[PDB]
């Protein structure tokens, strides 16, 4: 069975953790989380050798009450605990904090609804009512999705991707109508299949990208008046495109992750030519994240239960026959800590090389590869 091979390979991983990691923490959550994002704040403790970092998590339970979660993590300047539980209707598909106000968190639900929460407007412990009380309900979609991106340059601008083939755009600062409701400012109808992900450009407030099951990458400009035709249509992959992410240091670079088992690299100055293709055997990629500290570093996760960390600067490098046996030199590190599909991961923005990854079997891991692997 696959479960016997997984338990055995986990024990081999577990025993080798002192030789691969400088930091590795494992925590079993009450429910699996489909989402993971570090909050930007760090609370320094007076006289203690640790600092307190926070994570946005969610639950995925079908019989019981779901929650949006704020977890605390003690990291060196080892306890992980839930600080805040907020009732959520259905599982939290994705939860992301507003870059201009980290108290504001948007969530994707297993319904048409896109919700906005201000966690400071809620108690730490939820009421036994079972009622989901978001501060805003964003209208525009017909179906659920996962794709969610806040505009880092234009305060309150949020993009969402849906199974209904559309991309919605909201301005959450707009005057709400009826019951805390905001209608979509625009709906982008370029794709002819389920939209898997959306991402704003990190420097140009009017530019964003989208990826879908139609195997395309679309580049959009909100300054254009036609919301059915993107600026560019890129024939990015040979299968469904599940994710995309813009490089936080280069204003021209972005990555796409796909069901065709690859991560593609793109330059906005030359979209007709794919810069590079990172390949990993029998791994349908669902998440790609650039390092917030190092321009050439990005990580990916798919269905193979591993987390791959890539280094762009090592492409086309000479390798010893021994090293070459582990794979291409651009494959910097493999994290084999999980025993189920990784649902999401997030780079710690305050402590370089620290990552939080969450899997389908309810495990959350906080880890950092050995300083040695990258230096």
């Amino acid at each position: 069975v696959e479960e016997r091979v997984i338990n055995e390979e986990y024990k081999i991983w577990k025993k080798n953790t002192p030789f691969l990691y400088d930091l590795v923490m494992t925590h079993a959550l009450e429910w699996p989380s489909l989402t993971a994002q570090w909050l930007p704040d760090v609370t320094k403790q007076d006289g203690k050798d640790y600092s307190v970092h926070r994570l946005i998590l969610g639950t995925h339970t079908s019989d019981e009450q779901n929650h949006l979660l704020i977890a605390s993590v003690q990291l060196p300047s080892g306890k992980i605990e839930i600080e805040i539980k907020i009732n959520h209707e259905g599982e939290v598909n994705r939860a992301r904090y507003m870059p201009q106000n980290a108290c504001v968190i948007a969530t994707k639900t297993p319904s048409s609804d896109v919700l906005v929460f201000d966690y400071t407007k809620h108690p730490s412990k939820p009421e036994p009512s079972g009622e989901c009380q978001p501060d805003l309900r964003l209208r525009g979609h017909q179906k659920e999705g996962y794709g969610l991106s806040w505009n880092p340059n234009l305060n309150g601008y949020l993009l969402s991707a849906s199974d209904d083939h559309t991309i919605c755009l909201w301005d959450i600062n707009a005057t709400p109508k009826e019951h805390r409701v905001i209608d979509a400012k625009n709906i982008f109808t370029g794709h002819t299949a389920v939209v898997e992900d959306v991402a704003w450009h990190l420097l140009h407030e009017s530019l964003f990208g989208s990826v879908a099951d139609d195997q395309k990458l679309m580049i959009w400009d909100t300054r254009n008046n036609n919301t059915s035709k993107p600026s560019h249509t890129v024939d990015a992959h040979t299968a469904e495109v599940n994710c995309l992410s813009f490089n936080p240091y280069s204003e021209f670079i972005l990555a796409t992750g796909s069901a065709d088992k690859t991560v593609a690299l793109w330059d906005l100055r030359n979209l007709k030519l794919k810069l590079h293709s990172f390949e990993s055997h029998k791994d349908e990629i669902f998440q790609v994240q650039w390092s917030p500290h190092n321009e050439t570093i990005l990580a990916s996760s798919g269905t193979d239960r591993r987390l791959h960390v890539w280094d762009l600067s090592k492409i086309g490098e000479e390798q010893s026959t021994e090293d070459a046996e582990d794979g291409p030199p651009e494959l910097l590190f493999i994290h084999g800590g999980h025993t189920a599909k990784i649902s999401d991961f997030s780079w710690n923005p305050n402590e370089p090389w620290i990552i939080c990854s969450v899997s389908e079997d309810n495990i959350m891991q906080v880890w950092q590869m050995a300083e040695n692997v990258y230096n």
Binding site: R306, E322, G327, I334, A370
Partner: peptide, 13 residues
């Protein structure tokens, strides 16, 4: 499907 890269083990470096 490797668990880790043998080149990333501290004792192999």
């Amino acid at each position: 499907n490797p668990i880790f890269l043998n080149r990333t083990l501290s004792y192999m470096k």
